[PDB]
Ligand binder design. Structure first.
Ligand code: SIA
Ligand code: SIA
Ligand code: SIA
Ligand code: HTQ
Ligand code: HTQ
Ligand code: HTQ
Ligand code: PLM
Ligand code: PLM
Ligand code: PLM
Ligand code: NAG
Ligand code: NAG
Ligand code: NAG
Ligand code: F
Ligand code: F
Ligand code: F
Lengths: 532, 532, 532
């Protein structure tokens, strides 16, 4: 029939139907819907403003650009995380505040299906929404899937520490996309009364941040963090952020007389000029030559006084905030291959010794945040075993993963629980067939592996076994049920214990079964070690 | 006496008194009155905004700049259409939103004289208001004459097809200046309740557009289109305008990743950079090599969705719309010398044959928009007459004139007529003594020839025979009478029948008398041909 | 016990304590508090906009930058006027709208002490607030002292003479600071209901202008003009100013097609570019050859139609406005050494004859504004006496001093008196030990010599004698009493008569006592000569 045409507040939107195998009702897809005014010129380094309305019918049938980022790194991550057959090459632009919608609802009628907003990851430096296709999830579980984008790197996170540039522009874009949904999603057969935000990695941490922010209050009703939370140090800048702002400005060829002078100067810079600055800063690579405490991994989240009134530690410590069902999960080997490879980690010999371990762990300061006085003990706790240099390197990775995702995730889960809100945890342990060739088959539950089950990659790509297909059908149902009742459980699916005092979590993989006290031991150790 | 000082909404304006040979009543003249804020910087490619108010008295005693255009092309047209003796040298600037006023009213007393607002032509690419002196008309028929300006070329008509740059900036200016008139004319002895708009060529097509625009309603009560209407295709863009925008962005050295990207980039360019882009484009000149269907004649009117909700063809269909007295006229030989000479036509030998005719007609695509399979029938219907190559060249010029003005003008008139509103038509056939020395004396009723009678050139220049002086007097009468009563008739003047079903019109010239069915046979042929 | 933290409408401010010998209660100092939004980008050449509120605690413990100016000239004047022991070197920046506060109040309690707002001088081309340390005056007279800054030169006074750039930006900033004081001063223990503005030189003229401006109505309750008033021609521009605008524009490398075009262009220029333009104009210096009337001193105050509705002459002619106690004073030798030296006067021979003098006075047209036909007359009235060139040189200095400050000051005073408001006058006659070596010891009461006494330099620098100390205590007490009651009289002080019909004034110096009719003779004379 005639392409799908939905009416929104700003104007009519045109899309295209896409039927999936085994589903009569085709899925309506809208690509590149603007949810905010293009942040160009004077709007750079400022909160997102509403999108100007249009006079006729807007054709939303073309993938939007991805926010300015390292094009090589961007395309690489996309190819590794995409759930669709062939990766979709994208263009770069500052005009990237768009979102993609996938509704399996029959627009001719009135439907109120649950809405699931996806926040992509990429360390807040790279990524896009187009990378994730929701055609499968939307059909198999009959939910309206929405993928959003937000300013990355300098454009979405540059902060001078004061009012001239508070920061968190990227986080504000997410909040704006959430309001867009509350105001228009009903036009796509989605129930604005039931919105679930979920994201992986930096997207995960973003979810945690939104769950603690007063600005997002009432913009969602359930949240899910996949391998990433607000306690994930590397993504949250604590202390005086001024030194960073100046370092960036100097590189860009700007004076540092005052804050307003820097912001003004940086606004004058071109996109290419700021992309070059980015490349020079080398944000997603382990800095070897230099002091570990001087390596700037990124311009993560900050305490601007708007989105976040104080550090995540401080905020969660209190129990006076709108609580919602929150699902926090991690993978078996978060630091298995993906992250180390991208960051170009030194580990290439396949083995390591205490001395070298403590040497590498040190330079990993901008990631784990371990005082040089805690290096020995930390290394001993994980490598103080077998003489096998090879088995050491493996325990070294588990060492890093526990500090970045493991312990943090569990902590957030505990606090949310104590806050008196429905909490859930899981430990994904599986090795997708879509993995990379360079990835050693001895790795399972790597960073981002759960993505393929979540977005039903086995229903779009080819070569998926019946075992890999069912696993996905299970995850999608678990997720979708949560978006529906704030409870993953359902008929035909194993039992998922709510993370309470017993601290029971679900283990997903070849064999999905419940368990208890995830990393419980690991947490204890670090909680004391970190206490100096 | 002392310089006239009128009080307007945004401040007091100072002018000067000028006396015309024989008239005791001195005419108050104001030059350079702003009717909007200068469309500089971010205000480029945006609607005109109200002008900021001034403190003391503003000297409105100097000619304003003409809108940025091809300085050479603009200077030529100014010297070929000016009715004043010596041609005034103008300056270029994006700061060109001014209007000139000519009032014979006695400012010392309340006066409600009819107001005639003039809209200059020039293919929407060149032109200016200072070119036309309103002294003679204002004094002879006692009416306030107002010449207005509007953004041209890229500045006034650049459109990306969407909300990022809808377009028709130039027409919105025409509207702004009209609202200004309704708000201030009374202070100049003019009656806002009786404003007549009239223009020639592009100024004519503009009147035709305002007559059809829901925004213009109530800003004028009488319309006059001299050689140019909404059906003159060359000036109206249909279909996706996105290609033209992208071609312009590229020529200016801008990326085309998205609409917003283009507009932002172009807004960062200097006036001169856009003027160089203009010259590079080579607009008003016939392209003889390439593809006629791709040739870009100019940047005209589009369907923004604010000024025009749909194409003129569809608009004139409806009856449910406000209607006013409309006078549509054309010249004997619209494609006689002027236009061809300006666009550099291959016509130099002074004759033409059937074979070279069909070829030329095709390259003339951007003007007559005639299919390539229709060329044979069209050429045979006009040139199949005699075997005289010279007559074939003249009958070929009649071909282009009919398609660009003849047929369009009549169709527009018949629609206004059947719409239930007073309509009037005429055909000017005379050769002013103010013609160029380069125009053959055999050309009678060439494009723009009426302008000399309309603006009483015979009373400002020299060499005008009494016969020509007489023609001018009659013309200004009819006009002013039409302005006064929406009817040209008045004792002392030949009778001008209303354009009703008998399709009676007036032939102006040495011998002025009525006739019937103007271009009747012509309209039939062209409507039937295009039907295929 | 802990750094001073104060809450304001815009956010928290953090200062520092500084104790002054003789006072138990340490003074709370706040440096660099923003009272407006940085006048950058499109904000240049526009009214000051409110400052953006900050989220946490802002540290105002660092000296703010001074507005862009001649770095050399700026730093020189600061060392010559500074009352602190060591001159503080400052940075330049368009982001200069800050104010400094010195409060002797105990912020742990509720206090409401009189507020004295200082407006530094420097011909509206240079100067800073930081130059003046309020520590002494604040502690000694128990009053809150506020030092403000305002846009200088082109940035603060560029006028096209119309609505596209009225001018007086620098005066608007001063008014913007006064509003900030009324909204937040109570947080600093200040009494918003008792604000006294005072300034020296261009600061004196500013105060004088604020007294005639409707915009300053109810923003201060007492005024003090030290050596400068609104009748000091040199700082006030009369007549068409457009010619000056164009002159700057061309120098800066801009077009001059229209006013809007000129302002649009200058806004594009970088700080460094406008600064280089400043240095080129040679604003401070004096041209010895050419034509005196073709020179150009500066960009003083203009008649914008906002800040000032008409010339100070016309405005003071009316007794229709808010009348507040006004104190106007001058020094013994206004043109004794300081100004001449800074402009580089050819008086490097210490001698001057009746013929060489008539030449200088003419060349000094932009400073005295005297028709060349009058030069001979005036020159006689002063130098027509002794045949001693050495005395002629001195009498010549008295000539200029009387025309710039002497006569203007008394006239301004008398008019205020006749308006029926409290008036007072004084004449400082002392030679501060904190003078410059290169300064002749025969010069007593040079321009700005009262500043050392007013700001208590004897209590900040070293070597002051018991006499110089006593003088400073007396002056401060006099100023503080005036701020308190609008009357300088108090116990322990001589009697300062009001400026009624007897025209009594105070002779401040080593021997302070009252007198009558200040410059009465000179006032009568000049008024006559100028009557031509
Ligand atoms: C690259 C591209 O095709 N641009 C298209 C854009 C984009 O879809 C939107 O900017 C969101 O991507 O808008 C249209 O689709 C539309 O509204 O009619 C037309 C145009 O073809
Ligand atoms: C370039 C130039 O000379 N500017 C002139 C302008 C123009 O009138 C307006 O810009 C409209 O052109 O304003 C004046 O006339 C005026 O109001 O006193 C002064 C001046 O003569
Ligand atoms: C570069 C500079 O000196 N500016 C400084 C400003 C100024 O103190 C205020 O803006 C008043 O001028 O704020 C800081 O001191 C601060 O709040 O800690 C840090 C910053 O470095
Ligand atoms: C892309 N990798 C390169 C070539 C193949 C693959 C394994 C090898 O890595 C190592 O020896 C590391 O020690 C390592 C890294 C990541 C996971 C396991 C082991 C280096
Ligand atoms: C300067 N002109 C050149 C040589 C003489 C004169 C007429 C001719 O004109 C044309 O071919 C035109 O196409 C034309 C103009 C006007 C009337 C008829 C035909 C070409
Ligand atoms: C260096 N100066 C020389 C010798 C001592 C001192 C004073 C004198 O000049 C004057 O008295 C002039 O009045 C003057 C001219 C220029 C600058 C400052 C003072 C000339
Ligand atoms: C390409 C490099 C991609 C960066 C994404 C991996 C880092 C994840 C994280 O820091 O949370
Ligand atoms: C069929 C109706 C015919 C009128 C259209 C004529 C084309 C106009 C033009 O080429 O400018
Ligand atoms: C160094 C330049 C400083 C100029 C300051 C002197 C005051 C000038 C004046 O009052 O006209
Ligand atoms: C928009 O889509 C419609 C229907 O698919 C099509 O007719 C039109 O050409 C498209 N417009 C664009 C973006 O070219
Ligand atoms: C504020 O000042 C304190 C010291 O007084 C300093 O430690 C801190 O860095 C400043 N705040 C910031 C982050 O600007
Ligand atoms: C405009 O004319 C008036 C009338 O004397 C004059 O005051 C003003 O300066 C003139 N403008 C210019 C810049 O020529
Ligand atoms: F991430
Ligand atoms: F035209
Ligand atoms: F000064």
């Amino acid at each position: 029939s005639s392409p799908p045409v939905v009416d929104t507040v700003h104007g009519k939107v045109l899309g295209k139907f896409v039927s999936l195998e085994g589903f009569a009702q085709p899925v309506a897809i809208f690509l590149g819907i603007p949810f905010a005014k293009p942040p160009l010129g004077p709007l750079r380094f400022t909160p997102p403003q509403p999108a100007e309305p249009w006079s006729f019918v807007k054709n939303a049938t073309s993938y939007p650009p991805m926010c300015t980022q390292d094009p090589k790194a961007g395309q690489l991550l996309s190819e590794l995380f995409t759930n669709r057959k062939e990766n979709i090459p994208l263009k770069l632009s500052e005009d990237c505040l768009y979102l993609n919608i996938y509704t399996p609802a029959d627009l001719t009628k009135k439907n109120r299906l649950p809405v699931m907003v996806w926040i992509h990851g990429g360390g807040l430096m790279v990524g896009a929404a187009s990378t994730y296709d929701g055609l499968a999830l939307a059909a198999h579980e009959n939910v309206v899937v929405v993928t959003i984008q937000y300013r990355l790197g300098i454009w979405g996170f540059f902060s001078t520490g004061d009012e001239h540039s508070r920061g968190n522009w990227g986080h504000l874009d997410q909040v704006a996309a959430l309001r867009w949904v509350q105001d228009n999603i009903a036009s796509f057969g989605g129930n604005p009364g039931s919105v679930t935000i979920f994201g992986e990695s930096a997207g995960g941490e973003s979810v945690s941040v939104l769950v603690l922010s007063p600005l997002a209050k009432n913009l969602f009703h359930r949240a899910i963090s996949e391998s990433g939370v607000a306690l994930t140090s590397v993504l949250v800048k604590k202390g005086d952020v001024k030194p960073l702002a100046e370092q960036i400005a100097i590189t860009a060829g700007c004076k540092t007389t005052t804050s307003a002078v820097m912001v003004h100067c940086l606004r004058q810079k071109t996109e290419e000029e700021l992309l070059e600055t980015t490349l020079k800063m080398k944000f997603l690579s382990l800095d070897l030559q230099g002091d570990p405490r001087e390596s700037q991994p990124l311009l993560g989240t900050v305490i601007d006084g708007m989105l976040l009134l104080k550090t995540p530690e401080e905020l969660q410590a209190e129990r006076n905030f709108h609580t919602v069902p929150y699902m926090v999960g991690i993978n078996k080997q978060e630091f298995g291959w993906l992250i180390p490879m991208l960051m170009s980690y030194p580990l290439s010999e396949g083995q390591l010794d205490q001395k070298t371990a403590m040497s590498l762990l040190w330079k990993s300061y901008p990631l784990v945040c371990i005082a040089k006085e805690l290096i020995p003990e930390a290394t001993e706790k994980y490598l103080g075993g077998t003489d096998d240099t090879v088995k050491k390197k493996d325990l070294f990775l588990d060492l890093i993963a526990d500090v970045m995702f493991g312990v943090p995730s569990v902590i957030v889960a505990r606090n949310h629980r104590d806050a008196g809100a429905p909490t859930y945890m899981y430990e994904f342990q599986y090795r997708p067939s879509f993995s990379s060739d360079m990835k050693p088959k001895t790795v399972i539950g790597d960073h981002g592996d759960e993505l393929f089950s979540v977005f039903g990659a086995p229903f779009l790509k080819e070569g998926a076994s019946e075992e890999e297909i069912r696993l996905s059908k299970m995850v999608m149902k678990f997720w979708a049920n949560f978006a529906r009742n704030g409870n993953p459980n359902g008929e035909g699916l194993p039992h998922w214990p709510e993370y309470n005092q017993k601290e029971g979590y679900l283990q997903i993989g070849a064999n999905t079964q419940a368990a208890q006290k995830l990393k419980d031991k690991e947490v204890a150790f670090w909680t004391n070690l970190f206490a100096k």
